[PDB]
Amino acid sequence: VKIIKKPKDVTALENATVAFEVSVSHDTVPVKWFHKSVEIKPSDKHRLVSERKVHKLMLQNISPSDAGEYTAVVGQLECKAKLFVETLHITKTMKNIEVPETKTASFECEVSHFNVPSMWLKNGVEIEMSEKFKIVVQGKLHQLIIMNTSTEDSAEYTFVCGNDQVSATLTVTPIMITSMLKDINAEEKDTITFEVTVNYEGISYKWLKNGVEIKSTDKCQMRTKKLTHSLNIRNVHFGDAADYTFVAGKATSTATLYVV
């Protein structure tokens, strides 16, 4: 009896199902399979199937323990093939971030394979995605986005990949109002400007008049150069006299406009 087809090497992922097959010239021929010098038996992991001239060994839910050389013995005839078992792992680490308050922070890591489930932890606890936490997957790149950061977002963040994991820390830096609002004594019809300076660029802020948020009309313009924020109020009259507040993250500053 002659071997017509020999088994081929197989590369597969952990937990995948794989097979090896030999085919022979004659129908009634018994076959044994060996791994690590031991004869393979039917089990929850091993299935042996014959169809006339074709003999198959099937392995379910493979583990790294299953990798290596398998041998098919047909009489005195013996042929070998190898299983390589690939495992999920992290291929690039994450960098610690420091981010100003209110700005967006992002962690990224790369994994070994496509179609890995995203799994992100904050101080050991699974993060449920929300308007705050955005999870993105781009092929083998996994990204965690944390929007509108606060000091409460400062923590250790972990990405889990199979049995592999990688951690990095986020540090959220508070906004500081370096140059505060000063009171303004103006005459009717004057154009005035409240100005503040902060320590970071591109932060979120709000202006308030007596506590109610202002929107920039032709009457109240809000401008922003580098770190300087301004509230310009044109053609000032008595209804413009009030308390004005600049709010940025947890940083606040109030002053008064007086109109003669």
Numbering used by the authors: 4 to 263
The authors write:
Evidence accumulated over the past two decades has identified titin as a main coordinator of cardiac muscle homeostasis, and its dysfunction through genetic mutation as an important factor in cardiomyopathy. For this, we examined the unique mSNP T2850I in the I-band domain of titin I10, as a paradigm of an alteration in a general component of the titin chain. Domain I10 does not support specific interactions or have any known specialized roles, so it does not constitute an a priori sensitive locus of the chain. In previous studies, we have shown that the T2580I mSNP destabilizes the affected immunoglobulin (Ig) domain in titin, I10, and speculated that this instability increases the vulnerability of titin to proteolysis in situ potentially leading to myocardial damage.
I19–I11 crystals were produced in (c) 0.1 M Tris HCl pH 8.5, 30% (w/v) PEG 4000, 0.2 M MgCl2; (d) 0.1 M Bis-Tris propane pH 8.5, 20% (w/v) PEG 3350, 0.2 M sodium acetate. A three-dimensional model from (c) was to 1.9 Å with Rfactor/Rfree = 19.28/22.83%; and from (d) to 1.53 Å with an Rfactor/Rfree = 16.15/19.65%. Three molecular copies were obtained in two space groups that agreed in showing I9–I11 in an extended conformation. In I9–I11, the component domains follow a regular arrangement, where domains display relative torsion angles of 45°–68° and are connected by short, two-residue sequences (TL and PI, respectively). In each Ig-pair, the domain interface is consistently formed by the A'B β-turn of the N-terminal domain slotting between the BC and FG loops of the C-terminal domain. Both I9–I10 and I10–I11 interfaces consist of a central hydrophobic residue contributed by the linker sequence (TL; PI), flanked by two polar interactions between loop residues from the neighbouring domains (inset). In addition, electrostatic potential maps of single domains in the I9–I11 tandem revealed that the N- and C-terminal poles of all domains are, respectively, positively and negatively charged. This suggests that an electrostatic component further assists the organization of these Ig domains within the titin chain.
